[PDB]
């Protein structure tokens, strides 16, 4: 039947991959929807949706450029038992001599598939052919257990691939960081002024019928259609979107937050992110992108935005995927703080009186996604100072966003968000009172809590519990504010912290 058979996974979805290259009919290649793969971790019934119509539509564009593709949805993949065995059985049955794959983007997948074995059957794996920093050589550029700095693997990496360059090897602009004028809040006018998001019309209605036939279990909800960027078309149509409406704003709003308006959820950011892991844009295209709209802005997008947007891809998705391969097996075991609280249950219903984290979760819920200064310094914030169980948080921030992979969580939960690797990515716990949302967002106008109150009754939580969690954690001017008490004002905070933490179910 077959020689060859090839795996592709539902985030190898590169339509630029050597493999199609060429057309060959000894070449069977494989897609299949896994009930392994939905039981690893909750996933959002949203990112369920989003990653089997992207696997279709890539098994309908790779069929139409002629390739073999068998597409095995659950109703097909539930007689074999795991991924190995619908690999061993169906390379039996076509009497293939060989399997190839793409090295695949968890650390349990990975190792998977390296321990596969078959028999008769050479086995071969080879690059995604999507990253940017190539996979051999994360050994040199983030050694083992070391707190390797970002910005100069940054200033590195735009050395290496020539963006926002001068002739004489020097930034553009005259620094290398653009983010001290990419921290404003949004007000009235701008409020006003907020861009419509790019939605897509996908129906997934077979897709759930499918999964619920199944019982499988998932979180959070979904309608009758799916507005998240199914295949390449939508991908490039939403990058599209964003550099002509919402690049010239990007970093100017990046850290901010608001409540009242309608498009709250998406802002000026370009909720890329599952294109980008799904493999459906390359890094490369869309830093690309980005650029060549600056340059043709002729000023009306200011250098900040663009390096903004750029450094998030440039050097911080491809320092935490280095950190992540660098680190994974002892990384998931880190909990630098011992943080073991059990996560609070509106988690799972965004039914609390802080107005920050009911707008996140239900936000998460809702939508499956949130913008980055939300997961770090809402519900990050917030599982850090709670000292929530950074277990059931990395569960929480892979199931709930759908472009939640573990090479990319993994690092930004437990080590930026929780500290709880010690400090080898963020160097620092990025605790905060309720001072920087009352700053960076709206929230505070529509909480319950007051935030320019500490202690006492209807005082904002964050306020007792970042000094707590500092005062817990001194031994490492920030402390200045809090020498800067009487001794009763500081009991009355480290009272209602605890107060709180008792009651963290009622927030
Ligand atoms: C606690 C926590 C958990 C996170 N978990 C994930 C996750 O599972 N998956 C994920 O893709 N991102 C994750 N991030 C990073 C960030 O939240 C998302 O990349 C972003 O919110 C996706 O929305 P966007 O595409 O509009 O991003 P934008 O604001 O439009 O940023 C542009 C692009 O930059 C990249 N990027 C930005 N920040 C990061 C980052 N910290 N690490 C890696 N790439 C980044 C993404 O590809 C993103 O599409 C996490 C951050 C935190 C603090
Ligand atoms: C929800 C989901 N479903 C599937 C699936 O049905 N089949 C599949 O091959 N992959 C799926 N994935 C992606 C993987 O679970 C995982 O995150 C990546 O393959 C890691 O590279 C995800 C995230
Ligand atoms: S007052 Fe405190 S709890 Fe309420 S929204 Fe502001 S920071 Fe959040």
Redesign the pocket.
Known sequence: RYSVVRLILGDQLNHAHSWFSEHRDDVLYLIAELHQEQEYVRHHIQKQCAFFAAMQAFADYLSAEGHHVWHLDLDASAQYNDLPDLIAQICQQVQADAFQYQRPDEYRLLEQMANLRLSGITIGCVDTEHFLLPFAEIPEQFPASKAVLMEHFYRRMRKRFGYLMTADGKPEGGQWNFDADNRNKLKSPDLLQLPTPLCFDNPVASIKARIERHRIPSIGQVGESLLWPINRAQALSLLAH?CQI?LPN?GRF?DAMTAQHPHRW?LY?????????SKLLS?RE?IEATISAYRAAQGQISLAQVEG?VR??LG??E???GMYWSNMPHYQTRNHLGAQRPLPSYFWNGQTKMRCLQQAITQSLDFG????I???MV??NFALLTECDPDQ?DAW??GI?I????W??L???RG???FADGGLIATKP?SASGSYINKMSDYCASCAYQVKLKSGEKACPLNSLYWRFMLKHRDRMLYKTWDKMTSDSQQAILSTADAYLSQIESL
């Open positions: 964003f919402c990007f990046q998406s950011h370009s909720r890329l992110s599952f294109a980008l892991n890094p869309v947007f998030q891809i911080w998705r320092y935490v995927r996604y949130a913008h980055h939300q997961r770090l519900t990050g948080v921030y892979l966003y472009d939640a992979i573990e990319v969580e690092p930004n939960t930026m968000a929780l990025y």
